[PDB]
Design a protein around this ligand. Structure first.
Ligand SMILES: *[C@@H]1O[C@H](CO)[C@@H](O)[C@H](O)[C@H]1NC(C)=O
Ligand SMILES: *[C@@H]1O[C@H](CO)[C@@H](O)[C@H](O)[C@H]1NC(C)=O
Ligand SMILES: *[C@@H]1O[C@H](CO)[C@@H](O)[C@H](O)[C@H]1NC(C)=O
Ligand SMILES: *[C@@H]1O[C@H](CO)[C@@H](O)[C@H](O)[C@H]1NC(C)=O
Ligand SMILES: *[C@@H]1O[C@H](CO)[C@@H](O)[C@H](O)[C@H]1NC(C)=O
Ligand SMILES: *[C@@H]1O[C@H](CO)[C@@H](O)[C@H](O)[C@H]1NC(C)=O
Ligand SMILES: *[C@@H]1O[C@H](CO)[C@@H](O)[C@H](O)[C@H]1NC(C)=O
Ligand SMILES: *[C@@H]1O[C@H](CO)[C@@H](O)[C@H](O)[C@H]1NC(C)=O
Ligand SMILES: *[C@@H]1O[C@H](CO)[C@@H](O)[C@H](O)[C@H]1NC(C)=O
Ligand SMILES: *[C@@H]1O[C@H](CO)[C@@H](O)[C@H](O)[C@H]1NC(C)=O
Ligand SMILES: *[C@@H]1O[C@H](CO)[C@@H](O)[C@H](O)[C@H]1NC(C)=O
Lengths: 208, 344, 227
């Protein structure tokens, strides 16, 4: 079988710049195919036979390579070019490289939301921490309950990169039983992010 | 000086004007007489690139055979894209004859004489001829019948072996007769006999050749994974009747690996069908029941058509299944050593 | 223009089989193979197999053999005889088979090989789960106080996807983030929708999130106010 290894995993660049994406095959001598997949859209063939552009593909997409090393070059990046790109040879595929929009670092605004009494009435407590409008996407959110770090009991979700301001938002949801919730006082989410000179903490005291 | 080029070929043959046999009749109207003293010139110091998988001579043969079958093998009923066509469908005389393909003035055929030429890349021993050798337009699936043999070693042909979608042509260097009969006195039931000792030895050699191309992985045969009977069975036409033979016994891994019992006669079960899926891609055709008497044709198996399994594997073996089904491949197996060039 | 149109998304129970159709038109259906490929969350693309429409010859990915069957049907319309339908049936489903399935076809140019897929069906999402259809509970994420405040709705414990969320019946859109749903260990989905607004307005403006879950025929209007 052929193993295709794409890099980098994420590429951060601005409109107008040129992106270079790499695909290394475990076997040499075959031609390379590339696809574009914009978020939520059908995949689109870009390049076949290593360097030939598919139907309706603009000339700023340039495929090249030889042996085991293959490249997709995207000149003068357009807003639409920010997408995930996959390489293929025969039935084998790379795991994809994401091209994302670079912009200035932006610290998240952080908010914490205690669970509602109505949800508590039902036996479960959801505590939510929102990190709004930040860049880059990488952030560390830590839940602490009475200063004990919580792990394995929260789930995160992240928005798609905003099409206009290139920021992300993230939510982390700590889920506890009502009995567990009512045994502790201080609930806090600590956020660590490049845009912050030191970690930011938002918290509340249960029933206060 | 010359250059790769495509042109309209013409055909030559020794068809008889008095024959009612259908290939004879077609060639009489389509072809010219064969040349008694063919000129063949070896080209000294000349190397030439070939590509049997991109050879327009193949397209032209295909069109002719389609033409022949359309003129000659009219079915009692034709079912195409939801339409119906009823016609006379008399029994016929059917027995393919050799057809030569030839270049007109201003062109010539370059022929590759390299003993183990696999159909593509450079040829060092090249000659110039006006016509291909005589090629019988035998339409079959799974097995190539009554064709030419590889001159030295068994040859593996594929446009791209790494590509599981490309048919593999195994070109044998020694033929094995297959003997098919529908006895006189179920009228549609028939069978094909092969010498097991003959065949299993050949098939062993085949698997050994495949190892050379497939990293010495264990070579394993499986039956076709699906499809119409024309492709899941060995399909061919004998005396105008459409045969379908179950080739399961032909690809018995137990035999090729070294056991006992596998020598002696293999008898494939076959059936003649009146309702067939047309290889021309035209739909379904309905023919009258079989003629009476012992329907029998003995052929040389000279080639095998295979597909190889793909997928995210990394097992210790490769799996091959009889198949293909693109009749153009039959013409490729005979035209592989030829290409047309234009003189200036 | 070539067009491949697949059948709609479906929810399947483990142990089920799914049969997906791909109606192909705008070219001679017999002349081109159709492939099937699946895009699996967190694992990428996996080629499933191909079918050649003339004889319906097939080839299945080794690792899926025994679980996949491809067939085709050719148009039976005398004045429109060249289109056809390809079918793929996938059996013994598990949650790991939750993916988007595509039928695809190669380009028709001279240098186009078999695997560069120029034409794609719109995809068919198959979710394999033993979960029962269930509408969401909706809970408030209440604003805790010039500055800007955040508020939202927690949409919890529904199956299957999707739920849609608007605010104030669509009149409020600026600054809304409705997060991708997450699959909880219960097998039920959950998401939040949040919006940032002026702290100044918290006493003057009303905020209502409109939640629609069609699979359960569930509609909820949740008014969210300061805690
Ligand atoms: C092998 O496949 C590649 C595409 O991966 C194709 O470009 C090449 O032509 C194939 N082999 C040959 C030399 O025909
Ligand atoms: C072609 O070249 C070979 C040596 O490379 C020589 O032996 C031969 O005589 C040449 N043929 C002619 C007659 O040009
Ligand atoms: C080329 O073919 C001729 C017969 O046409 C043969 O005598 C000669 O040995 C062959 N040469 C090579 C290099 O295969
Ligand atoms: C045939 O030989 C050519 C030239 O050596 C090579 O490129 C090609 O891979 C070979 N094909 C097969 C199937 O052996
Ligand atoms: C069958 O093969 C033999 C050689 O094994 C050959 O002499 C004969 O011409 C072949 N018969 C055909 C082509 O019908
Ligand atoms: C046929 O080819 C095989 C190699 O593939 C070889 O071992 C055998 O000697 C050949 N038989 C002949 C010359 O007929
Ligand atoms: C072919 O098989 C039939 C019996 O099925 C037999 O009569 C005939 O002798 C066989 N032909 C040859 C030449 O072996
Ligand atoms: C061929 O025969 C075998 C029995 O030996 C049977 O299992 C198989 O279904 C047959 N194949 C076809 C396509 O009829
Ligand atoms: C395979 O060969 C063995 C040994 O001769 C035999 O027992 C078995 O029936 C064969 N299987 C078939 C006919 O496919
Ligand atoms: C099979 O062919 C071998 C020679 O290759 C021969 O000895 C034997 O007679 C044949 N088997 C039968 C049963 O006719
Ligand atoms: C192979 O050739 C012989 C004539 O030499 C013929 O009897 C037999 O029918 C041919 N086979 C086919 C399938 O055309």
């Amino acid at each position: 079988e052929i193993v295709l290894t794409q890099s980098p995993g994420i590429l951060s660049l601005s409109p107008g710049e040129t992106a270079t994406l790499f695909c290394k095959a475990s076997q040499g001598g075959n031609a390379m195919t590339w696809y574009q997949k914009r978020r939520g859209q059908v995949p689109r063939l870009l390049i076949y036979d290593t360097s030939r552009r598919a139907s309706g593909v603009p000339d700023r997409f340039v495929g090249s390579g030889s042996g085991t090393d293959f490249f997709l070059t995207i000149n003068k990046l357009d807003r639409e070019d920010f997408a995930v790109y996959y390489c293929q040879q025969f039935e084998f595929f790379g795991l994809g490289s994401e091209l994302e929009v670079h912009r200035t670092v932006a610290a998240p605004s952080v908010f914490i939301f205690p669970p509602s009494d109505e949800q508590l009435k039902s036996g479960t407590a959801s505590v939510v921490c929102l990190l709004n409008n930040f860049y880059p996407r990488e952030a560390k959110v830590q839940w602490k309950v009475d200063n004990a770090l919580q792990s394995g009991n929260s789930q995160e979700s992240v928005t798609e990169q905003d099409s206009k301001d290139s920021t992300y938002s993230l939510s982390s949801t700590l889920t506890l039983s009502k009995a567990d919730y009512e045994k502790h006082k201080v609930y806090a989410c600590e956020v660590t992010h490049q845009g912050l000179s030191s970690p930011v903490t938002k918290s509340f005291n249960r029933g206060e | 000086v010359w250059k790769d080029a495509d042109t309209t070929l013409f055909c030559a043959s020794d068809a008889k004007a008095h024959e009612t046999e259908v290939h004879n009749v077609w060639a009489t109207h389509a072809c010219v007489p064969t040349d008694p003293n063919p000129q063949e010139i070896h080209l000294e110091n000349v190397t030439e690139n070939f590509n049997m998988w991109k050879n327009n001579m193949v397209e032209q043969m295909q069109e002719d055979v389609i033409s022949l079958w359309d003129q000659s093998l009219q079915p009692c009923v034709k079912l195409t894209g939801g339409s119906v066509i009823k016609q006379a469908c008399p029994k016929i005389s059917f027995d393919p004859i050799p057809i030569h393909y030839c270049t007109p003035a201003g062109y010539v055929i370059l022929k590759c004489n390299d003993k183990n030429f696999n159909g593509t890349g450079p040829c060092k021993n090249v000659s110039s001829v006006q016509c291909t050798h005589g090629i019988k337009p035998v339409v079959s699936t799974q097995l190539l019948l009554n064709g030419s043999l590889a001159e030295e070693e068994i040859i593996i042909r594929s446009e791209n072996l790494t590509n599981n979608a490309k048919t593999i042509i195994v070109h044998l260097n020694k033929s094995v007769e297959i003997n098919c009969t529908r006895p006189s006195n179920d009228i549609r039931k028939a069978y094909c006999e092969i010498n097991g000792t003959k065949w299993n030895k050949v098939l062993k050699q085949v698997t050994e050749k495949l190892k050379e191309h497939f990293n010495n992985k264990t070579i394993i045969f499986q039956p076709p994974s699906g499809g119409d009977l024309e492709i899941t069975m060995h399909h061919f036409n004998c005396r105008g009747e459409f045969f379908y033979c179950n080739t399961t016994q032909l690809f018995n891994n137990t035999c090729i690996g070294n056991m006992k019992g596998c020598n002696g006669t293999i008898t494939l079960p076959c059936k003649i069908k009146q309702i067939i899926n047309m290889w021309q891609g035209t739909g379904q055709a309905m023919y009258a029941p079989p003629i009476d008497g012992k329907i029998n044709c003995v052929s040389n198996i000279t080639g095998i058509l295979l597909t190889r399994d793909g997928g995210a594997n990394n097992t210790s073996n490769e799996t091959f299944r009889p198949g293909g089904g693109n009749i153009k491949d039959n013409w490729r197996s005979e035209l592989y050593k030829y290409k047309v060039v234009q003189i200036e | 223009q070539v067009q491949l149109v697949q059948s709609g998304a479906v929810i399947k129970t483990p142990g089920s089989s799914v049969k997906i159709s791909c109606r192909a038109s705008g070219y001679n259906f017999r002349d081109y193979s159709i492939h099937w490929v699946r895009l699996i969350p967190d694992k990428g693309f996996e080629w499933i197999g191909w079918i050649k429409p003339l004889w319906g010859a097939v080839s299945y990915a080794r690792q899926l053999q025994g679980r996949v069957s491809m067939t085709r049907q050719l148009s039976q319309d005398p004045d429109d005889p060249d289109w056809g339908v390809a079918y793929m049936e996938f059996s013994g489903l598990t949650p790991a088979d939750t993916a988007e399935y595509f039928c695809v076809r190669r380009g028709s140019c001279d240098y186009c090989g078999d695997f560069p897929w120029q034409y794609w069906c719109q995809g068919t999402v198959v979710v394999v789960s033993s979960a029962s259809t269930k509408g969401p509970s909706v809970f408030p994420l209440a604003p805790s106080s010039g500055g800007t405040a955040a508020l939202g709705c927690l949409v919890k414990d529904y199956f299957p996807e999707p739920v849609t969320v608007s605010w104030n019946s669509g009149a409020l859109t600026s600054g809304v983030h409705t997060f991708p749903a997450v699959l909880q260990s219960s097998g039920l989905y959950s998401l939040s929708s949040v919006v940032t607004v002026p702290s100044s307005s918290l006493g003057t403006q009303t905020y209502i999130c409109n939640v629609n879950h069609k699979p359960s025929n569930t509609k909820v209007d949740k008014k969210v106010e300061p805690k």
